[PDB]
Every structure is written in structure tokens, then in C-alpha cells.
mmCIF file of C-alpha atoms and ligand atoms in Angstrom:
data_model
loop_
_atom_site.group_PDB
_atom_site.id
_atom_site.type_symbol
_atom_site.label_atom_id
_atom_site.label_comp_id
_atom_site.label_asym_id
_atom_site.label_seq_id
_atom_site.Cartn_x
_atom_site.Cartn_y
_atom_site.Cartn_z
ATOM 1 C CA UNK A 1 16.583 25.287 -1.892
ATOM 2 C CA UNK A 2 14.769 22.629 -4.164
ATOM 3 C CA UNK A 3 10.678 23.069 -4.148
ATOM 4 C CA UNK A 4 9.101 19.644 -3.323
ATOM 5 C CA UNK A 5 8.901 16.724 -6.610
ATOM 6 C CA UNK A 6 7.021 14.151 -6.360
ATOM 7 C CA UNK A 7 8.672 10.164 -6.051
ATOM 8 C CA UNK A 8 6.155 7.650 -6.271
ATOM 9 C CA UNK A 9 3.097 9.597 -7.262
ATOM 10 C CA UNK A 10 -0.362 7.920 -6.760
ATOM 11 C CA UNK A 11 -2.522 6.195 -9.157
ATOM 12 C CA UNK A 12 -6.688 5.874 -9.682
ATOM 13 C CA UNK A 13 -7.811 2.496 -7.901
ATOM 14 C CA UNK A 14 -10.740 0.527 -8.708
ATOM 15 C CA UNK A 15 -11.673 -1.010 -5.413
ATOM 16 C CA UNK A 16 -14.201 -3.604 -4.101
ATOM 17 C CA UNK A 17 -16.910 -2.791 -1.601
ATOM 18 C CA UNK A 18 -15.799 -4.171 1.559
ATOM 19 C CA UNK A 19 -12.550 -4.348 0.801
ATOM 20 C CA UNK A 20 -9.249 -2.221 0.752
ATOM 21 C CA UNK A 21 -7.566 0.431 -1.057
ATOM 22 C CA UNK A 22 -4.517 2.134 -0.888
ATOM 23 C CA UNK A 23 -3.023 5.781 -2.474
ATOM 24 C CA UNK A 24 0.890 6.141 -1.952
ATOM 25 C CA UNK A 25 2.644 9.759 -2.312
ATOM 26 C CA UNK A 26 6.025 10.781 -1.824
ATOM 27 C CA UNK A 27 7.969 14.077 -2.800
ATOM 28 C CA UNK A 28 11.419 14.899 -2.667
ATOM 29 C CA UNK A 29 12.969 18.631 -2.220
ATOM 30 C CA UNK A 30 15.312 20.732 -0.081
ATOM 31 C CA UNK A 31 14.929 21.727 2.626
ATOM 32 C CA UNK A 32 12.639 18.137 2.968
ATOM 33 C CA UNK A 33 9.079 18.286 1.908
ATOM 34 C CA UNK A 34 6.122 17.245 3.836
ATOM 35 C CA UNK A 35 3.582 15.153 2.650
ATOM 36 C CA UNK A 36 -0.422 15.154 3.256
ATOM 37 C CA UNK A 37 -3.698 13.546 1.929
ATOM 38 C CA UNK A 38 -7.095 15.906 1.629
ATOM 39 C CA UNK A 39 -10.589 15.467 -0.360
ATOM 40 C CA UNK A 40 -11.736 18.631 -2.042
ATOM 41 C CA UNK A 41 -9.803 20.596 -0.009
ATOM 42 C CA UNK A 42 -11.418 19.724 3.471
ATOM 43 C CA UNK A 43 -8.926 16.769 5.031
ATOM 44 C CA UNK A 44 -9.390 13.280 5.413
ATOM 45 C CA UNK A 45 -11.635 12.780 8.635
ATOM 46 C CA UNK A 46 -13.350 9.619 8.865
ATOM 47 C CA UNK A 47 -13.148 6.839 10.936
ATOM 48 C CA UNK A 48 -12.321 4.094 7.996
ATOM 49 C CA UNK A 49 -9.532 6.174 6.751
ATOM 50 C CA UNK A 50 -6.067 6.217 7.509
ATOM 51 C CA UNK A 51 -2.570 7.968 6.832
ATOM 52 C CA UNK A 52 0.614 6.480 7.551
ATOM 53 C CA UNK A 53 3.666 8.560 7.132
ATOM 54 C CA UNK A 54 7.144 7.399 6.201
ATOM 55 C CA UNK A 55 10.291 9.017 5.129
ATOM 56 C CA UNK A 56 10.365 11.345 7.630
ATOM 57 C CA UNK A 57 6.714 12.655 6.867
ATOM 58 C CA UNK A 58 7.915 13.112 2.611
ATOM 59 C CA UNK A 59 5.771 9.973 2.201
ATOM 60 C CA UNK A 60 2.421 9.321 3.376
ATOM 61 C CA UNK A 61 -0.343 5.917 2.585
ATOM 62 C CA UNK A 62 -3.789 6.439 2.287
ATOM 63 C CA UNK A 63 -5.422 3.472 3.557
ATOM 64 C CA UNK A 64 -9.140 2.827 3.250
ATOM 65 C CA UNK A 65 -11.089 0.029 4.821
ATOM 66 C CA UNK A 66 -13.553 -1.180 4.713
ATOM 67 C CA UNK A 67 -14.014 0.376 1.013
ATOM 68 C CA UNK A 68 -17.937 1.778 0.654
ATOM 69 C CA UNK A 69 -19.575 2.619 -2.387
ATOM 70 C CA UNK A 70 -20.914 5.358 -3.278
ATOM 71 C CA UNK A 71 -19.971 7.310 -0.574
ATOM 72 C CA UNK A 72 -15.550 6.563 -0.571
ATOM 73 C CA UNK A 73 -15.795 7.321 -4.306
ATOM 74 C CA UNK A 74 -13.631 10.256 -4.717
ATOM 75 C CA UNK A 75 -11.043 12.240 -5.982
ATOM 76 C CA UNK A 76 -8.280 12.867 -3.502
ATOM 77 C CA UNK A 77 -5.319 14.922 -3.138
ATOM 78 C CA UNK A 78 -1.674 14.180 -2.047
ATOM 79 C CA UNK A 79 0.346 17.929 -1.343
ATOM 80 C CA UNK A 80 3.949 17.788 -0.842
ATOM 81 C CA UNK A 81 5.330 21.398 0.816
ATOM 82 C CA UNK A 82 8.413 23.067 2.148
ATOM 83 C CA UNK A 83 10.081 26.621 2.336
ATOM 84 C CA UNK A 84 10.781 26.551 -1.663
ATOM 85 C CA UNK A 85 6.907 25.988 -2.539
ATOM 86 C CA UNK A 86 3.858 23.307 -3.253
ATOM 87 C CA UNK A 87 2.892 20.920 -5.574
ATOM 88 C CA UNK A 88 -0.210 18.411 -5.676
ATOM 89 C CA UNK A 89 -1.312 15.778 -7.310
ATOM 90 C CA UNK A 90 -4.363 13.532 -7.068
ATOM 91 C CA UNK A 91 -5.722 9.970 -7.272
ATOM 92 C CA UNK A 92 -9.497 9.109 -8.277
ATOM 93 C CA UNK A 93 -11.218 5.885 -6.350
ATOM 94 C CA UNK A 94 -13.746 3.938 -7.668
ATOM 95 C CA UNK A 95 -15.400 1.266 -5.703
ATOM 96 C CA UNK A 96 -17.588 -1.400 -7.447
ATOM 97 C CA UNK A 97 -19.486 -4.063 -5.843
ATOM 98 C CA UNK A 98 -18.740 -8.067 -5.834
ATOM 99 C CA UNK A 99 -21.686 -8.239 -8.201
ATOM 100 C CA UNK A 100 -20.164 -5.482 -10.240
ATOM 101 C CA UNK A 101 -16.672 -7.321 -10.918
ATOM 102 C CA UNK A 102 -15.350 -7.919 -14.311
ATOM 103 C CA UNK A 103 -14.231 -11.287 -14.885
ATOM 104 C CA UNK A 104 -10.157 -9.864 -15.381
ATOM 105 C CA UNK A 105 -10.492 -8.759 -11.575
ATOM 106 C CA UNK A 106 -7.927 -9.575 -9.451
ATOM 107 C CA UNK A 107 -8.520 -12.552 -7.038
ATOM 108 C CA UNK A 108 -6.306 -14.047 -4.568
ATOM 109 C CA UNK A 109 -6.843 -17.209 -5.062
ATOM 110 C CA UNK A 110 -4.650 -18.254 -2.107
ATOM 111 C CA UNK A 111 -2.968 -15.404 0.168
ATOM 112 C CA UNK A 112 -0.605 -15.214 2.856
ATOM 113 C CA UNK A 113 -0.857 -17.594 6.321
ATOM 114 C CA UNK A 114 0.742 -17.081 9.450
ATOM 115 C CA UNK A 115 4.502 -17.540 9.598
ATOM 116 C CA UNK A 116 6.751 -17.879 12.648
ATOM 117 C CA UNK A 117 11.275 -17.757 11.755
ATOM 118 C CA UNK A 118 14.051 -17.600 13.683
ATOM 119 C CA UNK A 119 16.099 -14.158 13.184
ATOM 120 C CA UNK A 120 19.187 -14.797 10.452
ATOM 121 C CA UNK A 121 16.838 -17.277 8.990
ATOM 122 C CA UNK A 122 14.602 -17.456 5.435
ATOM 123 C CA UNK A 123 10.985 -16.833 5.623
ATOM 124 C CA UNK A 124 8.908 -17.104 2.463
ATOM 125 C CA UNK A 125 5.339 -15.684 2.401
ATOM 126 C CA UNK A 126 3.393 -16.990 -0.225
ATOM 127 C CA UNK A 127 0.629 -16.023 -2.657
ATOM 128 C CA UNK A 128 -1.089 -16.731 -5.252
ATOM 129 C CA UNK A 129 -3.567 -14.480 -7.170
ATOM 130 C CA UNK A 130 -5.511 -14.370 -10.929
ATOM 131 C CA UNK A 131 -6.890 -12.200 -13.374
ATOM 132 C CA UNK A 132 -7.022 -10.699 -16.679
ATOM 133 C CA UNK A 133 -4.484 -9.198 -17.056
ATOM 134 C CA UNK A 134 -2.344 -11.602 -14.834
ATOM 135 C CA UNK A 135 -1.762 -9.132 -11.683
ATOM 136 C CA UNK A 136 1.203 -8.199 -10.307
ATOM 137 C CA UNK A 137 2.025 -8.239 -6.703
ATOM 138 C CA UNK A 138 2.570 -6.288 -4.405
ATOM 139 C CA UNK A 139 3.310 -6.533 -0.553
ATOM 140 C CA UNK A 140 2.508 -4.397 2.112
ATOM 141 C CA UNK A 141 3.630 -4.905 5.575
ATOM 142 C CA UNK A 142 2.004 -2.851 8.302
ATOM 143 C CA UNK A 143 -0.124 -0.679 6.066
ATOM 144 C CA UNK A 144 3.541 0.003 4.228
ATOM 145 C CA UNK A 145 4.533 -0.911 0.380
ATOM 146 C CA UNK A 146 7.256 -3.172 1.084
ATOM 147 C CA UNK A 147 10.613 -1.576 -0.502
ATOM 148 C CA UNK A 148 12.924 -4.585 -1.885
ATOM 149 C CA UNK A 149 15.915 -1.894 -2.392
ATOM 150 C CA UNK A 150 15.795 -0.299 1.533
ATOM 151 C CA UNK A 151 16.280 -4.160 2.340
ATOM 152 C CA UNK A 152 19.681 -4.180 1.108
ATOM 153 C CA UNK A 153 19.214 -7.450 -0.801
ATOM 154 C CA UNK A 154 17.886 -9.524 2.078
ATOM 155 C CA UNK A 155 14.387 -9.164 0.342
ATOM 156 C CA UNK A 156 12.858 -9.388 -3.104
ATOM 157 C CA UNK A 157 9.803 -10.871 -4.713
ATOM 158 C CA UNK A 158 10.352 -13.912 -6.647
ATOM 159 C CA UNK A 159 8.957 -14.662 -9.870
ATOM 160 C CA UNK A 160 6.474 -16.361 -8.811
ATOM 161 C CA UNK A 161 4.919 -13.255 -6.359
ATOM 162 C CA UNK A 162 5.826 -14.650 -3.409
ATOM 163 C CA UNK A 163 7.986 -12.749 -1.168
ATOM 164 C CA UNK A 164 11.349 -13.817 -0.107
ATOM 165 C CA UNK A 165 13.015 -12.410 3.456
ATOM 166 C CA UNK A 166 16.762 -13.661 3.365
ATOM 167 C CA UNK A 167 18.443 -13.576 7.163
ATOM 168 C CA UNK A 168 15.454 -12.087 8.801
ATOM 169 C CA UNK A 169 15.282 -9.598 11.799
ATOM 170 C CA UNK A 170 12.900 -8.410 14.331
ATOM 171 C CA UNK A 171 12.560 -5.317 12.368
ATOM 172 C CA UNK A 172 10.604 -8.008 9.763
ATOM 173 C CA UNK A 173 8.019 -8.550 11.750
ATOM 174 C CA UNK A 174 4.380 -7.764 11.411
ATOM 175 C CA UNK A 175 1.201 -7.433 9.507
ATOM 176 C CA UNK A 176 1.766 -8.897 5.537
ATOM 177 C CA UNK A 177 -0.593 -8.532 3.232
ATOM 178 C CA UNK A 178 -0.574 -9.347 -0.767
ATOM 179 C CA UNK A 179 -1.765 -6.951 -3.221
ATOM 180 C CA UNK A 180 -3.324 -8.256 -6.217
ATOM 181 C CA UNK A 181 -3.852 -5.148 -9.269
ATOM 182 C CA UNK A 182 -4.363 -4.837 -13.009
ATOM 183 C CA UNK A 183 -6.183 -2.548 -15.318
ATOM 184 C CA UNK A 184 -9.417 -4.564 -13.750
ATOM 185 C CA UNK A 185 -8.541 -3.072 -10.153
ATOM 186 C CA UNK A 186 -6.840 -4.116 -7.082
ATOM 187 C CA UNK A 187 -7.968 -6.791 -4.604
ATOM 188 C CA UNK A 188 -6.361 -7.179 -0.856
ATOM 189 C CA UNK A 189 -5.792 -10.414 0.697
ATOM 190 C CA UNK A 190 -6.467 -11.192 4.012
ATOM 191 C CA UNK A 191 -3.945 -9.798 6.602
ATOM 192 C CA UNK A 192 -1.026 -12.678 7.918
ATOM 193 C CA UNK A 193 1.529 -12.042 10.569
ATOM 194 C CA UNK A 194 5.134 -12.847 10.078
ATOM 195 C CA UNK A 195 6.641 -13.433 13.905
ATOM 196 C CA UNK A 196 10.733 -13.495 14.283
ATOM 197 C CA UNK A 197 11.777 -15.086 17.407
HETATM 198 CL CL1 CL B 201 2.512 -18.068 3.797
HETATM 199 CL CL1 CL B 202 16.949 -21.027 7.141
HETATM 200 CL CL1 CL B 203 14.623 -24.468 10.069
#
């Protein structure tokens, strides 16, 4: 009987109008926790919004899109729960305007295209992105941080951001898109589908 601990816990995202954002939460515990977004106590209910679970419901993605300003700007609030206890944590969001970008924010300057591979085979999505700080990558496919280490070495990014599938399966396929983020904010590229045939 472990309460719930969170694994990846969320972080404040400066957003741009129009665009998308993304909170990540998962906990840990025994027996397994249960994961869930809110704002200010009522729960997330709008039509722009989304929550994907993963890990059996321990892990949940906030998705917004598109992102408006003022009214997205929030605080909101990941809770991880089981039979032990709670525990929460939050995640603010700030959403600026095109006009209202620092030069340092992110920018893909070329992002992901379509991409069709033939199972057991290499595909490489590509893309590049700039900023100040440089940004780091980071790929999502189907809404979902892509995890390198649940691959089993058939994927990894490469150094330079684009992301390498070794021997791919049908299981690869679907919705890619590059995240772009530094102290500036994060930017979204434009969604590209990876097909396996
Ligand atoms: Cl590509
Ligand atoms: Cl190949
Ligand atoms: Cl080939």
C-alpha cells in the first residue's frame, strides 16, 4: 500500500494563440493510482480541451487547441488517487499572441511531412525548429509524448531532432507532430501522418 507519487509531473507553458499546448501527469503508487486534470476545482469541460489517458489511466495529456487568450489562461490541476491517499500538483498556461512573441520563441522552421514505410523498415521524420535558447524536441504521436525507452531501442531522436523508427510496425502508425520549447515557450508543428503498410 504505496499512496500515489508523481512520474513526469507537468510544467507552466507559454503558448501561442491559435496554437497548441500540452500538460503531461503521471503518478505511480500501489494499489495503481489514477490520474485526472481539473481547473479550480470544477473539471475540464470545454469543447477545445482534451485528456488522453495512458498507463492504465496513472497518466493522463492535457491537450488544448486551438490555444485562446485570455480566456485558456489558467492554472490547472493534475490529481493522482488510490486506496493509500491523494496528491496534486499543477501547471500554469500562458498564451501570448503572434504579435506578442519574443524573438527566442520557438519556430519550426520546417516540420514533419507525410511518410508512408514498409513494416521491419526505417522511417525518419524530420524537423527542424529555432530559437533562443535553441529548443529541444519533442515528438508526440497521437496526442502522446513519444517514449524512446517503451520502444525497446527501435526508436530514439537523433541529434539532430529528428526522429528515428528502426524496423517499424503497424503499432507506429499515426498522427506525428514536433514539439518545439525553451524558456521562450513551446510552438507545435503542423500534424503529419506516418502510414506502415
Ligand atoms: Cl518528414
Ligand atoms: Cl529500410
Ligand atoms: Cl526502401
Amino acid at each position: 500500500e504505496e499512496p500515489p507519487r508523481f512520474i513526469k509531473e507537468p510544467k507552466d507553458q507559454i503558448g501561442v494563440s491559435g496554437g497548441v499546448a500540452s500538460f503531461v501527469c503521471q503518478a505511480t503508487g500501489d494499489p495503481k493510482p489514477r490520474v485526472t486534470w481539473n481547473k479550480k476545482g470544477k473539471k475540464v469541460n470545454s469543447q477545445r480541451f482534451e485528456t488522453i489517458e495512458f498507463d492504465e489511466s496513472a497518466g493522463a495529456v492535457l491537450r488544448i487547441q486551438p490555444l485562446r487568450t485570455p480566456r485558456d489562461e489558467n492554472v490547472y490541476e493534475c490529481v493522482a488517487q488510490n486506496s493509500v491517499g491523494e496528491i496534486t500538483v499543477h501547471a500554469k498556461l500562458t498564451v501570448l499572441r503572434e504579435d506578442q512573441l519574443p524573438s527566442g520563441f520557438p519556430n519550426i522552421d520546417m516540420g514533419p511531412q507525410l511518410k508512408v514505410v514498409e513494416r521491419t523498415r526505417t522511417a525518419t521524420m524530420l524537423c527542424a525548429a529555432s530559437g533562443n535558447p535553441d529548443p529541444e524536441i519533442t515528438w508526440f504521436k497521437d496526442f502522446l509524448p513519444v517514449d524512446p525507452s517503451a520502444s525497446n531501442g527501435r526508436i530514439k531522436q537523433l541529434r539532430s531532432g529528428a526522429l528515428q523508427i528502426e524496423s517499424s510496425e503497424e503499432t507506429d502508425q499515426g498522427k506525428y507532430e514536433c514539439v518545439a520549447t525553451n524558456s521562450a515557450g513551446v510552438r507545435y508543428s503542423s500534424p503529419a501522418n506516418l502510414y506502415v503498410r
